């Protein structure tokens with residue numbers, strides 16, 4: 005606990021009784037846990053109230069059905085309806101479908117959150133501390149840190165606790181504290197006290213708050229507070245939903261439902277108007293009110309029928325399902341749209357190092373100069389074993405293990421690698437492995453120096469912990485690191501200003517030790533070191549050095565190379581201004597070349613494959629990297645971005661070549677080129693922007709801060725689980741796995757969610773069109789009513805519920821990942837599909853009117869009215885416009901009506917079977933591809949039998965139908981709806997477009 009940011013660095017150390025560079029003792033840490041608990045928010049708990057989710061009524065169309073059930077509860081309250089109790093059933097025929105879909109939605113959402121909360125909590129967050137039990141910095145669980153220990157944070161890292169800054173190891177320290185202060189741009193920090201105890205967080209310029217991200221620099225501090233006492237800890241419970249509105253496709257379908265509410269409203273008022281000339285009819289006694297209310301009920305019931313009441317849930321559901329399936333592949337979704345958006349991505353831009361490659365770095369080759377004589381230059385090359393970060397392996401020259409100390413060129417080589425380096429190693433005792441602290445490229449240098457052991461230090465009798473940094477520490481005692489010119493991606497190098505260590509001889513020379521991209525560094529060299537000697541840089545020397553770099557970077561190991569140099573005579577510190585990072589390059593001039601290291605960095609296994617799948621899916625993959633163009637092109641080949649022997653001259657570019665191009669040509673280069681190299685963070689962003697200017701959906705994958713701008717800019721930003729917190733922050737998805745395959749999977753899922761939404765709509769429209777075609781084809785062709793209000797509400801409950809929602813669990817189409825991506829501004833509803841909605845809607849409306857007719861006309865138990873309907877309904881009371889006045893009322897017989905209600909239910913459950921796939925046949929895509937659908941169909945048919953044969957029920961709805969031969973007819977008329985779509989799918993297949 006520390007109340008103050010207003011106390012000085014010394015006072016904070018004194019308060020906790022801690023040595024700045026050693027950190028807490030094991031006993032101190034024991035005390036501090038007990039007194040302060042673990043560094044974590046207990047919270048964890050309660051996302052959405054069981055109730056909250058229940059309240060996914062509130063939606064567009066569900067509220068309509070809600071109101072629709074009110075009028076039924078009020079019309080029932082006034083003793084009637086028409087038949088007394090049949091009016092209290094109505095309200096519950098409407099609630100039921102709503103409650104059914106609500107249950108499925110709530111369930112899928114709960115499962116989703118669970119799955120996601122499982123994935124998020126899986127891998128433990130880590131921190132870096134100095135603690136007394138170890139000399140070099142170590143990694144602990146962030147949960148285990150307490151007030152008082154010395155913590156190290158660097159560019160990329162998330163600040164793990166509230167920290168009072170002790171020492172800034174770079175020339176500046178920039179922090180992204182948006183999450184806490186709203187402050188959109190990163191802010192500078194210092195170590196001077198801030199007097200005001202009153203002061204607001206933005207004035208705490210010497211503190212780092214848990215949960216923020218370091219944007220630039222490296223610092224050291226002491227933890228003031230942890231857990232709930234955290235500045236961000238205090239404020240969690242509170243905020244008016246920094247939570248959000250719905251996804252593009254959701255807003256699209258919402259909009260589509262909105263204008264469907266128009267067309268249905270109209271057709272409904274039209275039913276009420278096309279009739280109520282049947283107002284005064286003998287059915288309701290002829291009152292000038294009763295018939296108006298009845299046909300008003302026909303309207304309302306027809307409305308609840310036509311309205312896709314489950315559209316709002318099926319999407320909410322397919323989303324939560326897509327998340328839950330991503331989480332099962334170890335993808336964290338931070339933003340709902342990600343899966344759909346990736347659905348129609350045509351270009352995936354990808355970082356190389358850490359993303360396309362493992363970022364498990366290993367120096368396996370190096371060289372220094374051997375001889376220089378006229379235009380003859382020779383190199384002493386060396387190999388190094390050990391691929392892991394473990395200080396175990398040998399230096400070989402001509403296949404024999406050597407003692408690196410033998411070569412003075414290697415002594416300095418190792419010196420630079422050790423001093424010019426902000427990273428280190430730490431031995432994990434539990435896992436039993438040497439793990440990096442900081443950047444891989446640097447940690448590889450660390451492990452290299454432990455293998456070169458150039459001053460012959462005695463390391464065999466050390467613990468695995470101590471062995472991890474021992475030779476590096478030896479070097480650190482040789483020289484005092486006065487300060488460092490932090491790496492920057494414009495100069496592509498890093499610097500360190502050093503003086504000899506005991507101060508014994510206080511002017512034998514300060515030095516700067518430099519490492520960087522070979523091309524930039526070699527150009528700023530005027531001397532080449534030869535052993536302990538120095539000679540001018542010349543053309544032939546430079547050419548030698550560079551050709552071996554070309555060799556290593558392009559050969560079969562594809563080595564990531566770095567050059568190491570020293571500045572023999574540095575400027576005086578007083579001539580050096582540390583304020584403007586843009587002067588660092590001049591300070592790193594007049595250098596002496598020492599050597600080069602070549603690093604192994606294997607491509608991930610799953611990549612080559614993932615890329616093929618992209619090609620097939622019509623998705624372009626582009627490598628984007630700071631690294632050399634040689635090594636990047638070679639890797640692209642090894643990955644399949646380029647073939648092993650393609651001319652790549654105009655489809656690979658450096659930042660410099662790309663900048664040399666006119667804007668028009670830059671944009672065009674982005675369309676053909678698949679490899680961009682030696683490129684800065686601003687270029688990564690610009691390439692993504694260019695792609696987006698062809699109105700394409702662009703994804704960016706990465707891991708470092710050099711990728712955040714591009715990650716923010718792309719439609720979907722995907723961060724590696726192994727990468728930086730700042731990459732993760734700027735992302736919409738995170739691959740905790742680091743598994744690149746998942747990106748392709750997520751593409752397929754987003755594609756499939758789309759397709760599922762389609763079939764759901766196709767099913768409902770084409771079916772609910774038939775339901776309306778029916779009422780209108782009777783009232784116009786001049787027939788008796790086929791259905792009643794409650795009978796309309798029944799087909800709704802039983803055709804528009806679970807059999808529809810179930811389509812959302814359709815399996816992916818067979819070719820879903822073999823067509824190009826969809827354009828995002830494509831007509832939701834295709835012109836050809838609208839015709840298919842009608843061709844199906846027509847057969848359904850005609851098969852149901854033609855069914856009630858067959859009962860009257862060609863049916864043995866029916867009266868034999870024979871063709872021409874006998875021409876009217878007029879008959880009324882006893883024997884009228886005497887046209888075979890044989891049978892009186894048969895109209896109002898339940899028989900014709902419950903015939904139609906059964907063709908309607910049966911036939912709707914039939915074209916649901918064609919809604920498994922847009923254009924695939926039931927022959928290639930059987931009904932059992934979706935079981936969830938089949939079970940829902942049974943529940944419907946089953947519910948529909950129950951209503952027919954459980955005696956109290958048939959009264960409330962209206963009398964049954966002869967099992968044996970009536971059903972044979974319903975099933976004879978309904979079944980062909982399958983055969984029709986199947987010829988219609990044949991059309992859209994063996995002729996094609998889309």
Ligand SMILES: Nc1ncnc2c1ncn2[C@@H]1O[C@H](COP(=O)(O)OP(=O)(O)CP(=O)(O)O)[C@@H](O)[C@H]1O
Pocket residue numbers: 355356357358443445446491493496497498519520521522565566628629630631632683684708710
């Ligand atoms: N800590 C460091 N010190 C000195 N030079 C470094 C360095 N890290 C990287 N470099 C050099 O700077 C170049 C540019 O780095 P940058 O971060 O832009 O690309 P990168 O190759 O490091 C990663 P990516 O492939 O993910 O773009 C590297 O290719 C390497 O030559």
Ligand SMILES: [Ca+2]
Pocket residue numbers: 308309310311312313800804
């Ligand atoms: Ca409906």
Ligand SMILES: [Ca+2]
Pocket residue numbers: 309771772775799800803804912
């Ligand atoms: Ca329906």
Ligand SMILES: [K+]
Pocket residue numbers: 715716717718719720721734735736
């Ligand atoms: K983005």
Ligand SMILES: [Mg+2]
Pocket residue numbers: 355356357358359706707708
């Ligand atoms: Mg990277």
